[PDB]
Design a protein around this ligand. Structure first.
Ligand SMILES: [Au+]
Ligand SMILES: [Mg+2]
Length: 581
């Protein structure tokens, strides 16, 4: 293929090709209408055909970055709509693309899609392929780093829901639990992916390679260290690809990996037959979430290769990363039950122990007892879960969430009120995800989800920074991010924010609000309280929360919504300044 774009079309087929390109446009230019995007997609798609006929046509030898980028620069409303993004056009590739990426909005502030059974069913029966595409649109433009192939898979599943439910009688009661389930999976899938993109973009491939080794050695402990390095290499490239935005190349390599993995399951995992039956995209999804394989029986103890062994310092100096990779693998395959995040912590620690012990007099005497500083980092996470699950069960979801709001607002009062609300809400849902799960399954479940959610915090923060505490924690480590935040305590350095009455005014429009957006208004007010009076003991906040509730309820159900929020509102406000010294 003297022509990359031709290659892609051949390799992917029109349907997906057309999808991935719409995703890309939707991800770079996030506030453009669906229509205007569809347009560009066909333009690029027609041309793609030109090149598959004539690999030698003018332009075909151009990179997919050049090509796609040139198209972006032709959008006429682009400076108007996107600002300093228009300036990226003045630049050569690959600086141009890099500039485009950096203008991707991680918090895009677009209407929260509140789905109507009846109307959505109409669009489906009408245009199934436009409906599918508009899904692709609306997700991708809200998740500009969403793993492109996986979002294809999700559009599929979304179609499978609507194709089935619009024929049931009570369409709504059929589909609405289904769209709700998926939604969580999609946000999880988004979160996971943005953490992959932040690994590479902020800590190098090295970082994301290790994230991999770990996870894969757990999935396929029956695989050689050779195999796993091949497998990793491949999957990192896919992820490097989807992150820098060459989505077609991404979707390709990923499918090539799926093909390879099934073409080799004999030297990877017994758990693969079920996956290696499916259609293209279903297959890859199933491989991702495969059952782990039984750990091989008679493996030596670790303590033999990496502590008892004589020439460990030596091997470590010979192939720094290989040796360390080796560790990560041997340790990862043995212990499926550890969280990935923990396993990697063990790895950096091991690295630290060797790096200190090697430049010493009697290096063996020093490193012999590494598995000692090592056990010490499997217990640290273990006690802080105990508390959380003790607290979740004793407070319920929304209640635990509010406790977290308080802890976080104290920890880093600096951070944007909107961020603290969204973050604390997600740390909350972790209770309901994990504490339910079997006592010993607990710590890994929580370690993974916190990994994502904390990254979300770092991602919103890095953009427009405020807390050196947040930044220090976000940048100093990737693995030790979670401990780093637990460590933080409130700042006597924090001068309390002044009283602003608009932060604690409640209009009769609090009863219009849905349950979710109702708690948010409430939770926001909690933050703005803790921000104004940071010293206030939960003693007081207790009756303050009981008080908003004494009031929201007394008016939202009063004879005249407003005459209440009118007079009874200011009452509450004078109240709480008398309440909080
Ligand atoms: Au636009
Ligand atoms: Mg390329």
């Amino acid at each position: 293929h003297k022509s990359e774009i031709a290659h892609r079309f051949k390799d992917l087929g029109e349907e997906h090709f057309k999808g991935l390109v719409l995703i890309a446009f939707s991800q770079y230019l996030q506030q453009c209408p669906f229509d205007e995007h569809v347009k560009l997609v066909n333009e690029l798609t027609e041309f793609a055909k030109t090149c598959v006929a004539d690999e030698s046509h003018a332009g075909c030898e151009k990179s997919l970055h050049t090509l796609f980028g040139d198209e972006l620069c032709k959008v006429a409303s682009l400076r108007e709509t996107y600002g300093d993004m228009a300036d990226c056009c003045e630049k050569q590739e690959p600086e141009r693309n890099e500039c485009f990426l950096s203008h991707k909005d991680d918090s895009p502030d677009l209407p929260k899609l509140k789905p109507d059974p009846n109307t959505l069913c109409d669009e489906f029966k009408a245009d199934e392929k436009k409906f599918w595409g508009k899904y692709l649109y609306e997700i991708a433009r809200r998740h500009p780093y969403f793993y492109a192939p996986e979002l294809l898979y999700y559009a599929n599943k979304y179609n499978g829901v609507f194709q089935e439910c619009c024929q049931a009688e009570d369409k709504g009661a059929c589909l609405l639990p289904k769209i709700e389930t998926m939604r969580e999976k999609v946000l999880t899938s988004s979160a996971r992916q943005r953490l992959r993109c932040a690994s590479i973009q902020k800590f190098g491939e090295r970082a994301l390679k290790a994230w991999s080794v770990a996870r894969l050695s757990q999935k396929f402990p029956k695989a050689e260290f050779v195999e796993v390095t091949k497998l990793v290499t491949d999957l990192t490239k896919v992820h490097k690809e989807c992150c820098h935005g060459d989505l077609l190349e991404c979707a390709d390599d990923r499918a090539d990996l799926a093909k390879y993995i099934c073409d080799n399951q004999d030297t990877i995992s017994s758990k693969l037959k079920e996956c290696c039956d499916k259609p293209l995209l279903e297959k890859s999804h199933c491989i991702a979430e495969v059952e782990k394989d039984a750990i091989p029986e008679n493996l030596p103890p670790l303590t033999a290769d990496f502590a008892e062994d004589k020439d460990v310092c030596k091997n470590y100096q010979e192939a720094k990363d290989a040796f360390l990779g080796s560790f990560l693998y041997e340790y990862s395959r043995r212990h499926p039950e550890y969280a990935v995040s923990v396993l990697l912590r063990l790895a950096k620690e091991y690295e630290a122990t060797l790096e200190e012990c090697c430049a010493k007099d009697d290096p063996h005497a020093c490193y012999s007892t590494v598995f000692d500083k090592l056990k010490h980092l499997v217990d640290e996470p273990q006690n802080l879960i105990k508390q959380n699950c003790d607290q979740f069960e004793k407070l319920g979801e929304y209640g635990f969430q509010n406790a977290l709001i308080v802890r976080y607002t104290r920890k880093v009062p600096q951070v944007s009120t909107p961020t603290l609300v969204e973050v604390s809400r997600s740390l909350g849902k972790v209770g309901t995800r994990c504490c339910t799960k079997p006592e010993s399954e607990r710590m890994p479940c929580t370690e993974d989800y916190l990994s994502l959610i904390l990254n979300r915090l770092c991602v919103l923060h890095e953009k427009t920074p405020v807390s050196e505490k947040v930044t220090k924690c976000c940048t100093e480590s990737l693995v030790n991010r979670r401990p780093c935040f637990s460590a933080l305590t409130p700042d006597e350095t924090y001068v309390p924010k002044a009283f602003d009455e608009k932060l604690f005014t409640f209009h009769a429009d609090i009863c219009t609000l849905p349950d979710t957006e109702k708690q948010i208004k409430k939770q926001t007010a909690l933050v703005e309280l803790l921000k104004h009076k940071p010293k206030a003991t939960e003693e007081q906040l207790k009756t303050v929360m009981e008080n908003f509730v004494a009031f929201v309820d007394k008016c939202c159900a009063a004879d005249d919504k407003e005459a209440c929020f009118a007079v009874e509102g200011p009452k509450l406000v004078v109240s709480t300044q008398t309440a909080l010294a």
